[PDB]
Amino acid sequence: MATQDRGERPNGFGDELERRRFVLHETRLDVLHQILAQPDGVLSVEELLYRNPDETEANLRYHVDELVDRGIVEKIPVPRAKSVDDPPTTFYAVTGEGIALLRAVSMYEEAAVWRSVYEQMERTDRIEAIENLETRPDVDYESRGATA
């Protein structure tokens, strides 16, 4: 987006501001930072529920669905893992555009701060099983502008 058009704000300016205000929401940033802090950068809804035990599934889905609709989060369907009852078959990753948006509001580097907190978090057998599923997608974050 240009800075100006004929000395005025460019046409999509107000919509860009709305997009930036949208991402500046504590539960949405919790989701985005949790995803980014995970070593392979993907999480299922079941895993997000575990990390956010004060929120309802309905509320978490509402924020994830909104994030996907806006192109900030990518919905990745995956096969059924053979080893596990009722495994997650959808995982979520942050997109290149989402990383760009987080950088624009100075909320991207904040994710790294939380890696060791989630690495050390106490896990149930079920969460350990999900974190080790063979069907977790492999996302190339380097190509999405992530810091290495």
Report residue 14 CA to chain centroid gap: 24
- State the maximum Cα–Cα separation within the chain, in Å, rounded to a whole number: 61
Report residue 23 CA to chain centroid gap: 11
Nearer to a copy of itself, 39 or 77 (CB): 39
Rounded to whole angstroms, how far apart are CA atoms 39 and 35? 9
Three-state secondary structure call for residue 43: strand
Choosing from 12, 59, 62, 121, the residue that interacts with a copy of itself (CB under 8 A) is 121
Q: How far is the CB of 84 from a copy of itself (least distance, A)?
A: 22
Choosing from 10, 56, 117, 134, the residue that interacts with a copy of itself (CB under 8 A) is 117
Partner from a copy of itself, Cl ion, none binding residue 6, C-beta < 5-8 Å depending on class: a copy of itself
Angle between helices 96-104 and 13-23 (to 10 degrees): 90
Partner from a copy of itself, Cl ion, none binding residue 9, C-beta < 5-8 Å depending on class: a copy of itself
Q: Is 104 in the site for a copy of itself (CB under 8 A)?
A: yes
Which positions lie near Cl ion, rule CB under 5 A?
A: 2-4, 44-46, 88, 103, 106, 108-109
Rounded to whole angstroms, how far apart are CA atoms 134 and 145? 26
- From residue 74, give the alpha-carbon distance in Å to each of 2, 11, 102, 139: 27, 27, 15, 10
Q: How far is the CB of 14 from Cl ion (least distance, A)?
A: 17
Residue ranges that bind a copy of itself, judged by CB under 8 A: 3-7, 9, 13-14, 17, 20-21, 24-26, 29-30, 34, 50-53, 103-106, 110, 113-114, 117-118, 120-122
